[PDB]
Every structure is written in structure tokens, then in C-alpha cells.
Design a protein around this ligand. Sequence first.
Ligand code: CA
Ligand code: CA
Ligand code: CA
Ligand code: CA
Ligand code: CA
Ligand code: CA
Ligand code: CA
Ligand code: ZN
Length: 468
Amino acid sequence: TGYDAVDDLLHYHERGNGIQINGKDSFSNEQAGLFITRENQTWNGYKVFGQPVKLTFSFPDYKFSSTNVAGDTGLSKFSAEQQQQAKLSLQSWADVANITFTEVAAGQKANITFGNYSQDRPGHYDYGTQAYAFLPNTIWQGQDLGGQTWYNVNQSNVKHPATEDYGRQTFTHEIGHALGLSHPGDYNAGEGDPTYADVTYAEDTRQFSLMSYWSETNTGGDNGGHYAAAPLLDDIAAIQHLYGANLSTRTGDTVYGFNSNTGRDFLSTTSNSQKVIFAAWDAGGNDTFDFSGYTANQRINLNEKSFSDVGGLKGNVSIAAGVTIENAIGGSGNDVIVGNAANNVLKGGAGNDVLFGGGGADELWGGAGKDIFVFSAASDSAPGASDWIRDFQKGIDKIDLSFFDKEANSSSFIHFVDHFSGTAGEALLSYNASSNVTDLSVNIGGHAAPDFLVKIVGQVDVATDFIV
Ligand SMILES: [Ca+2]
Ligand SMILES: [Ca+2]
Ligand SMILES: [Ca+2]
Ligand SMILES: [Ca+2]
Ligand SMILES: [Ca+2]
Ligand SMILES: [Ca+2]
Ligand SMILES: [Ca+2]
Ligand SMILES: [Zn+2]
């Protein structure tokens, strides 16, 4: 049934509350954020949390023959392409927490610096390392190393971050360290051989945090060979814990995905081939997840902290804690679209879709195809805040009320009548041929009056259009 599909999406990636996944403990979004910042170091001071911060950054002109604090040499300044991508990574962190970044001249002392290295010793090129950075307040010989980030330019992804997404992710990851974030678990490579089996909690994967090195496939995600460019779900919790949530970000009506007005590369796409991977942070307005241009079967959940399967990928889109996204538009595939307690405009597009509005007064459009509109509570469409199904086609679309009889474990609870009598479970269809509107009223609670009312544009055939 349509309800089965909804129920499935609602319990996708449940976490915390004593759950154990992969033989590992499951941490909630909150716990993961705290664990990722377990070093307690911030630019505001040790254990000083929730305060804004203003930081400077620059691209120093390093001398090739110079040796850095780590012992690496064959140094160089960031190229134009590298600088451009580093600035995009910085902004992605500034979008979510109260952090202000300001670029200073190559000579001026800056809090965060970017530099390339190519040799582990003079005259010897290093093809084995990727990058590293120092957390704030890292003191060495009376000097703070905090804010320094270094990258192995012999790696093509580091040299070409604009075309190699792992390079862009690396910039975001190292800057994360420079801001106070650690990897989600303790494990040393090089002089150690860690694997996902060495994680502290199940959600330590690239599906939840880009501070992680473990594949998203470990938790059931699948990014189709791509890498997230910006802070993921648990990274947002981590960074906002340190510097507070940015309440000024995208406060207007924002569109994510296709036809985006975000002005962010990782939140926008112009074709079915260009895949999105992101955790959405949005501080206000009436917002829309527009995934209309994708052909794959998608699963879109508008609940906060929940995961969606978008554009042919799995668990690649999520919504941060405290964010309310209002609308969703599916693509040409057979989609499952689950709304939240707010008023939502849900559009299935072509294909056979399953739409679930949840609470609030929702506006549901099945579009072309055999669509199913699902309900599981009187509050889903309360009289006075009724849902509207705007394009119902009798004999083609369906209204799924199967939840009620299943819960009641009775085939006679929900049953259609031609007139009410106060009995619980009575359902009544009222068709107005002049206005082309059908009222579906149900007395679920067994009150004097119906406690559930859906308004439908179009005729409904009781003999063929319901799943009970
Ligand atoms: Ca917005
Ligand atoms: Ca909103
Ligand atoms: Ca669709
Ligand atoms: Ca459809
Ligand atoms: Ca809703
Ligand atoms: Ca339809
Ligand atoms: Ca509703
Ligand atoms: Zn790292």
C-alpha cells in the first residue's frame, strides 16, 4: 500500500535511543555533534561554546625550499582555482554557523591559512598523503599552529578541486579541523590500519559527516561515486554547537535543487546528470525542494533531520535540526513524498507517486500517472484546515485509508454510509457536479461531527478509488 511506502520512509535511518547498527551504538544528530567536537577547542577559547566568531584567512606565498611545522617542503601558494574553491568551502561553513571570514593580504597574519606541499623531504616527492590541519589553540614552541591547513598538490584532486569533487570536499574537511572539529572517532592511519569497524558510533560515515573517511555505503547510503562539497547533517550540529546557528541564512522563500535561487553550487542542479548531495540549513521563509528534473524514482521526506533519496542516489539529501521546508516537487519517476506538520504543497509530477501530507492544510497534486494519496490521522485533514487534492482522476488515482482498519484490526471500522449517525468509522462522499468538488468526510473519533474532511477537485468513484 501507499501507507507501507510512507511508513518505510518515516523510519529510514532511525538513530539514537538505544539503537545498535552494524554492531555499533547509534548516536543521535545531537550526540554526534558533541562527539565530533570532543576536543572542546574553539577560536573563542577552550570550552567556550555558542559564541560568534570573526576570522581572517589568506593564501600565503610560500617558498618552495621552505619546510613547514610538519616537516614537509616543496611548498607553494594556492592557485587561482584552488583559492576560488577554498572560498566556496569557507562560505559553506559561514552559511550554517555564526562565523565571519575576511581575507587578508598574503603578508598579513591570518587565523586560517592554505598552502600546498609536495615533498616529505628535500628532493623527494610525496604521492602518499592528502592533507592535514591544526585545531585552534594548538601550541608548539609558544606558537599557535591552529588554523594552518596543508594540502598535497601532487594529488590531482587537490590541484583541481573545481573538477574533482574529492578535492573540494577535502578543503571543507580541513577547514572543519581549523574551526575545531575532529574526525568522528579516534583512529590513526599511516602508523595504524583503521577501518569502519573501528568507529565509536554507527553514523561515522560520509553520509552523516564529511569529517569522516568511511564510505556512506557503510550505513546504506550511495552517493554514486560523488563527494559532498559542504557540511553534512552531523557537521552542522557540530559547528553550530561551537559558534551558534546562523539565523540570517536564506530567510526568504528558497528553492533547492532545480530552478534554485540559493546561489550555491552544492544546492543547485540544472540537469538530470548533475547530482545533488547536501544537508539543508535554512533560517526562514516558504521553501521548496524542487527535484522535478530527475528521472529516477525518488523518496522525499520534508521532516527535519530526515533523509531523502534524490536523483538516483540514496540518502543523499537531508534537512538540519530546526529547519522547516514547506514544499516538494517530484520528478518523472515513481516517488514517495512525505510532508511535515506545516502546510505543504506536494507535487508528484509524472509517474506513479505516493503522497502523504501529514498535519496542517496541505495541497496535493498527483500529476500524471496513477497516484495514491495517503492519510493516517484525523488531524491530517481536520475540518477548518482541510487538505485539498487538486487533480484527482477517478478510476486512476487512489485514496489510501488503509491505516485505520489495520490499526483497528477490523474490516468494518472504516465503511461508507449515505448519511451519518455518530458511529465511529463512518465515511461519506459528497459530490458537487456544479463545482467539480467531492467532499470526503470521515468520523474517525466517533463524535457528533466528522473530525476528518478532505476536499477533492474531481469526481471520486467509491467502487474503485479507495484502499481500505
Ligand atoms: Ca528560506
Ligand atoms: Ca521554511
Ligand atoms: Ca513522480
Ligand atoms: Ca504522478
Ligand atoms: Ca503537512
Ligand atoms: Ca494522477
Ligand atoms: Ca494535512
Ligand atoms: Zn581530517
